[PDB]
Amino acid sequence: HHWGYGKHNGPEHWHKDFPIAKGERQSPVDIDTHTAKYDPSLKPLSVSYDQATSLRILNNGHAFNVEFDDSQDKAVLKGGPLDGTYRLIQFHFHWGSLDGQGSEHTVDKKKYAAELHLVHWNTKYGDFGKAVQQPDGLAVLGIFLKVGSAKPGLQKVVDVLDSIKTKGKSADFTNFDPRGLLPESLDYWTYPGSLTTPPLLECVTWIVLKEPISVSSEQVLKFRKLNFNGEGEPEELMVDNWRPAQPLKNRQIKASFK
Ligand SMILES: COC(=O)c1ccc(SCc2ccccc2)c(S(N)(=O)=O)c1
Numbered sequence: 001h002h003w004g005y006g007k008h009n010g011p012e013h014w015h016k017d018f019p020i021a022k023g024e025r026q027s028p029v030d031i032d033t034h035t036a037k038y039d040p041s042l043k044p045l046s047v048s049y050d051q052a053t054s055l056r057i058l059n060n061g062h063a064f065n066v067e068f069d070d071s072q073d074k075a076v077l078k079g080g081p082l083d084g085t086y087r088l089i090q091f092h093f094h095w096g097s098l099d100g101q102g103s104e105h106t107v108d109k110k111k112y113a114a115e116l117h118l119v120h121w122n123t124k125y126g127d128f129g130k131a132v133q134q135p136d137g138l139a140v141l142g143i144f145l146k147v148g149s150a151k152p153g154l155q156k157v158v159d160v161l162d163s164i165k166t167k168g169k170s171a172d173f174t175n176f177d178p179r180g181l182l183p184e185s186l187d188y189w190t191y192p193g194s195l196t197t198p199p200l201l202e203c204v205t206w207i208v209l210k211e212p213i214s215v216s217s218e219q220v221l222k223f224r225k226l227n228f229n230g231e232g233e234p235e236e237l238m239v240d241n242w243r244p245a246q247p248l249k250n251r252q253i254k255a256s257f258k
């Protein structure tokens, strides 16, 4: 009886195994755009993905991870609200059963069709496992997806999904360039929070871009053909793998823009 997003093991149950679920800096949150404070001290975000080396794509049972070689300083996030240098380890998405839901963060209560998370760890902690034990261990860049025109830079991901339909399947996935998933503007909101799946560790500086990217109805439909179940089990479509907004508590969301 492990955690998931099904009818009996979903987000409202997670606190029983992971009491940090009811903690002081949980994610995601609703971003109240009127209450977010412009912070002129924030720097432009620096996203340096020119030498990113993707390796593999994995159906992890909850979403799919596109994994990067993070054994050298290649693909890094810095600047913005961050001190030092964070290295890209993987990206994944969260999405809905319908276009009107699927994002984890919300903007003035608006839910997007999906949300991309590029996960990076702080190089001062040496590796990902040590970084997640620290309050400034991770930086996750969050990008909203809306349904409209296709994103040509997403198609290589969508095309490989039929090869990893079920939990625990992986496929080689080299030479994928995550710069093709970025919107034009790097204006962002930022706040201190958590992983959004167990173990829900409070180790993330969230950086959520204001401008969504557009993907086509066909691209998102292919996400919804994935399965939460293993091969040779009855089909459980991989949809609605998003955690809802959590209480903001004693936190301020800062904006990089006025
Ligand atoms: C459906 O979502 C996922 O499948 C998923 C998978 C990994 C991660 S971050 C890496 C990680 C490693 C080990 C344990 C937890 C998280 C996240 S998130 N939203 O917290 O960034 C979400």
Ligand SMILES: [Zn+2]
Pocket: 092, 093, 094, 117, 196
């Ligand atoms: Zn995520």
